[PDB]
Structure 1
Amino acid sequence: TKFSKEQLRTFQMIHENFGRALSTYLSGRLRTFVDVEISIDQLTYEEFIRSVMIPSFIVIFTGDVFEGSAIFEMRLDLFYTMLDIIMGGPGENPPNRPPTEIETSIMRKEVTNMLTLLAQAWSDFQYFIPSIENVETNPQFVQIVPPNEIVLLVTASVSWGEFTSFINVCWPFSLLEPLLEK
């Protein structure tokens, strides 16, 4: 429904810390300097989901302590750039298609690492171990909460060279609400 002023301040700080960890992690994986800027916004789930590209890499995840799911979404340009470089290539001119089984297998591990960094960012406020529930490439098939429910959307602007892409983490209010006291 809404958040206190203290509450969004806490969330910004948590994810700014995630962002710094993400920058170091991605700088390692893409073997170049990767800048990460974190912004936070509050909007309806329908507004978020309609902003998502077809196709994308959409990972639905939860934690041992969460009653419900959250979303980790990565643009495919970043997905294939990372993937190519991780496999030994230049990261030049990425395709625009759903990933194959092989590519999903490799990049799921990367997402698992990044979710672990997200969990580490949260460690003072709420311990959790992330687990991946589902992976989709079309946001039409992603309806974790009702359209009008408010979500906290964490946007990571990822920039390297002349390129700039995005990773989003979507936290539904119904997931955060029982934790808002902390």
Structure 2
Amino acid sequence: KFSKEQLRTFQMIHENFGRALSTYLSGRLRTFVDVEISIDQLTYEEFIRSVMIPSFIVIFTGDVFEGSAIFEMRLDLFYTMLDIIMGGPGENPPNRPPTEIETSIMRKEVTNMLTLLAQAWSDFQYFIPSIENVETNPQFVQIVPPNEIVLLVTASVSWGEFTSFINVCWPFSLLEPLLEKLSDRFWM
């Protein structure tokens, strides 16, 4: 359950994550990439189902983190990106699960990406993202009980006639410890 005060906190942070992100995707893709951040509260079951099968999911955590989060990228952007960083244009996004090199090359891509997220957070809780597991099928992750609420961070990656989404799933069972210390005792 989230506060209407704490919500404005996360908006400020992640909005910033989209700024460095916008500038990262642009430097990868080699052409301008606008990114618009949207954030919302949703049931974990309600999010996990809005994930298209198959897709590229990466469940991560940090050192000071108690639990784990999700960083999902829709396959169209995924394959568009791989096409680029390999000397190609990126005109056809295939509809299958990424292979050995595909996932291995894209892993390091979401690590850099994940880092900036950790940097937009540096003012509240610095952390060094350490990616736990990668899975191509969502009905296989089940991070925490399906009823819990999540802070879903949505990033509208657009450019050209193209437009996809990058989601960061911030569970409440990971936000409660730093919720009470940072947005409550000294701030309030």
- Tell me if both proteins adopt one fold, taking TM over 0.5 as the criterion: yes
Which whole-Å deviations, capped at 9, do the CAs of 1:58-109 have from their partners, x for residues lacking one? 0000010111100000000000100110111001111111000101110000
Shift of 1:181: 3.0
Looking at structure 2, the residues matched to 113 and 101 of structure 1 have their Cα atoms a distance apart, in angstroms, of 19
The corresponding residue for 2:151 is 152
Shift of 1:112: 0.2
Q: How does 1:70-89 map to 2 (within 5 A)?
A: 70-89=69-88
Looking at structure 2, the residues matched to 29 and 181 of structure 1 have their Cα atoms a distance apart, in angstroms, of 38
- Which ranges of structure 2 fall in alignment gaps of 5 or more residues? 182-188
SS across alignment from 2:90: coil
Shift of 1:142: 1.1
SS across alignment from 2:36: strand
Looking at structure 2, the residues matched to 145 and 84 of structure 1 have their Cα atoms a distance apart, in angstroms, of 34
TM-score in terms of structure 2 length: 0.95
1:3 matched to 2:18? The reply is no
Looking at structure 2, the residues matched to 179 and 102 of structure 1 have their Cα atoms a distance apart, in angstroms, of 37
Shift of 1:4: 1.6
TM-score in terms of structure 1 length: 0.98
Which whole-Å deviations, capped at 9, do the CAs of 1:102-141 have from their partners, x for residues lacking one? 0111000000000000000000011100011000011010
Alignment length, in residue pairs?
181
Divergent runs of 4+, >4 A: none
Shift of 1:6: 1.8
SS across alignment from 2:66: coil
- Over the residues paired in the alignment, what is the CA RMSD in angstroms? 0.7
- Which ranges of structure 1 fall in alignment gaps of 5 or more residues? none
Identity level (%): 100
